[PDB]
Every structure is written in structure tokens, then in C-alpha cells.
Amino acid sequence: FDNSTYRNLQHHEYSTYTFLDLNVELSKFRMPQPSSGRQSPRH
Amino acid sequence: WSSTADPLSNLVLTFSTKEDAVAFAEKNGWSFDVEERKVPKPKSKSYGANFSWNKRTRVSTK
């Protein structure tokens, strides 16, 4: 154990698409979305 | 300029009720046409309806 170093260095390796790649990866973990019964409020 | 020959072109009378105007016209010998008062009907306003979950009343902009 030690309080010497810094444990948040990983965000040094983040690119322009990292957030959306993570969203794509999590896409398969979700549950089916609820539906309002329309395709759009203008349908 | 704009010229007229009738002396009643500017005559407008104010009355509290329709019956008063009808009585005045009748006693003065004028034949008249009466139009019923038009009143806007009460309306149902809902600010929340601007953000409906499944209705068409949800607004796309504010």
C-alpha cells in the first residue's frame, strides 16, 4: 500500500471516438426500449 | 378630395343592450338588421401538453 502515484493515467490514451466506441460496445447490454406507439410526434 | 352627399355617413350610436338599440331604431322609423353578439368560446389550455409522451401536441421547439 502507498499513496504515492496517480492512478488516472489511462485517459492519456483516449482518442476522438473513444466515447462512441464505448457506447457501441454497451449497445448489446441494454434492455429493449419503451415505445410511445408512434414513429414520431408528427406521425 | 372625397365628396359625399349623404348626411348620415358619420352617424354611429352606442347602446348598452341590443333591445335599447332596437327600440331607438323603431321609434325613429328606421328599418334595421340585428346581428347576434359573437363571444369567443372557452378553451382548454395546458402548458404540460407541450411535452406529451405519446400525443401530437408535443412541440418541436420553444
Tab-separated table of C-alpha atoms in Angstrom:
chain	number	residue	atom	x	y	z
A	1	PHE	CA	0.000	0.000	0.000
A	2	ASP	CA	1.078	3.567	-0.791
A	3	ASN	CA	-0.430	6.969	-1.608
A	4	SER	CA	2.486	7.896	-3.872
A	5	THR	CA	1.467	7.552	-7.514
A	6	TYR	CA	-1.515	8.691	-9.585
A	7	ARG	CA	-3.955	6.038	-10.800
A	8	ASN	CA	-5.766	8.000	-13.546
A	9	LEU	CA	-3.182	7.910	-16.358
A	10	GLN	CA	-5.349	5.847	-18.725
A	11	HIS	CA	-7.182	8.908	-20.053
A	12	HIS	CA	-3.889	9.853	-21.689
A	13	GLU	CA	-4.697	7.194	-24.326
A	14	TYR	CA	-8.176	8.442	-25.309
A	15	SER	CA	-8.888	9.273	-28.953
A	16	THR	CA	-11.628	11.224	-30.731
A	17	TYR	CA	-14.046	8.264	-30.944
A	18	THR	CA	-13.493	6.562	-27.566
A	19	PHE	CA	-16.836	7.638	-26.081
A	20	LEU	CA	-18.863	6.461	-29.076
A	21	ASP	CA	-16.906	3.201	-29.304
A	22	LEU	CA	-17.824	2.563	-25.667
A	23	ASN	CA	-21.455	3.376	-26.486
A	24	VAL	CA	-21.332	0.890	-29.380
A	25	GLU	CA	-19.875	-1.745	-27.056
A	26	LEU	CA	-22.607	-1.141	-24.461
A	27	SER	CA	-25.345	-1.255	-27.121
A	28	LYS	CA	-25.676	-5.041	-26.656
A	29	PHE	CA	-26.052	-4.864	-22.845
A	30	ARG	CA	-29.224	-2.749	-22.753
A	31	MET	CA	-32.871	-3.802	-22.421
A	32	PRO	CA	-35.466	-3.126	-25.139
A	33	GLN	CA	-36.597	0.492	-25.133
A	34	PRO	CA	-40.185	1.517	-24.364
A	35	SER	CA	-42.277	2.843	-27.230
A	36	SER	CA	-44.792	5.683	-27.351
A	37	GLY	CA	-46.860	3.922	-30.025
A	38	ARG	CA	-45.757	6.264	-32.838
A	39	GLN	CA	-42.746	6.687	-35.086
A	40	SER	CA	-42.602	10.409	-34.241
A	41	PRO	CA	-44.781	13.137	-32.677
A	42	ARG	CA	-45.610	14.125	-36.282
A	43	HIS	CA	-46.937	10.681	-37.264
B	1	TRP	CA	-60.817	65.173	-52.164
B	2	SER	CA	-63.507	62.658	-51.205
B	3	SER	CA	-67.011	64.131	-51.529
B	4	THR	CA	-70.291	62.805	-50.147
B	5	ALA	CA	-73.947	63.773	-50.415
B	6	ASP	CA	-75.492	61.839	-47.563
B	7	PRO	CA	-75.638	63.464	-44.116
B	8	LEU	CA	-75.721	60.210	-42.099
B	9	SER	CA	-72.372	58.845	-43.325
B	10	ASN	CA	-70.683	59.509	-39.959
B	11	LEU	CA	-73.557	58.778	-37.546
B	12	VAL	CA	-72.748	55.983	-35.074
B	13	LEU	CA	-74.767	55.375	-31.907
B	14	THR	CA	-73.789	53.483	-28.755
B	15	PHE	CA	-76.179	51.313	-26.743
B	16	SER	CA	-75.920	49.185	-23.610
B	17	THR	CA	-78.083	46.336	-24.948
B	18	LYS	CA	-79.492	45.134	-28.249
B	19	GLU	CA	-83.050	45.857	-27.077
B	20	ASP	CA	-82.213	49.524	-26.461
B	21	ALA	CA	-80.830	49.942	-29.984
B	22	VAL	CA	-83.852	48.146	-31.444
B	23	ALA	CA	-86.227	50.430	-29.529
B	24	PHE	CA	-84.368	53.550	-30.679
B	25	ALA	CA	-84.405	52.430	-34.317
B	26	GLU	CA	-88.099	51.514	-34.147
B	27	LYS	CA	-89.175	54.805	-32.583
B	28	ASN	CA	-87.119	56.717	-35.161
B	29	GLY	CA	-88.751	54.820	-38.037
B	30	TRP	CA	-85.563	53.199	-39.359
B	31	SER	CA	-85.622	49.633	-40.630
B	32	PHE	CA	-82.831	47.623	-39.084
B	33	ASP	CA	-80.792	44.445	-39.231
B	34	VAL	CA	-79.661	42.898	-35.938
B	35	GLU	CA	-76.619	40.633	-35.643
B	36	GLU	CA	-76.187	38.477	-32.553
B	37	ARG	CA	-73.144	39.030	-30.359
B	38	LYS	CA	-70.150	36.807	-31.107
B	39	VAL	CA	-68.329	35.641	-27.970
B	40	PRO	CA	-65.150	33.519	-28.179
B	41	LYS	CA	-65.789	30.072	-26.759
B	42	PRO	CA	-63.872	28.902	-23.670
B	43	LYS	CA	-60.730	26.949	-24.484
B	44	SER	CA	-58.796	24.258	-22.625
B	45	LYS	CA	-55.167	25.320	-22.200
B	46	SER	CA	-52.470	23.021	-20.811
B	47	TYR	CA	-48.809	24.008	-20.651
B	48	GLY	CA	-47.841	20.407	-19.856
B	49	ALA	CA	-49.317	19.208	-23.156
B	50	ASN	CA	-46.322	20.857	-24.852
B	51	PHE	CA	-44.314	17.808	-23.711
B	52	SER	CA	-46.658	14.857	-24.248
B	53	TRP	CA	-45.234	11.333	-24.144
B	54	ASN	CA	-47.422	9.953	-26.951
B	55	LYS	CA	-49.621	12.743	-28.342
B	56	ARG	CA	-49.123	15.020	-31.344
B	57	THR	CA	-49.369	18.129	-29.137
B	58	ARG	CA	-45.693	17.925	-28.155
B	59	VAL	CA	-43.830	20.944	-29.542
B	60	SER	CA	-40.605	20.572	-31.513
B	61	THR	CA	-39.319	23.984	-30.389
B	62	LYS	CA	-39.800	26.578	-27.664
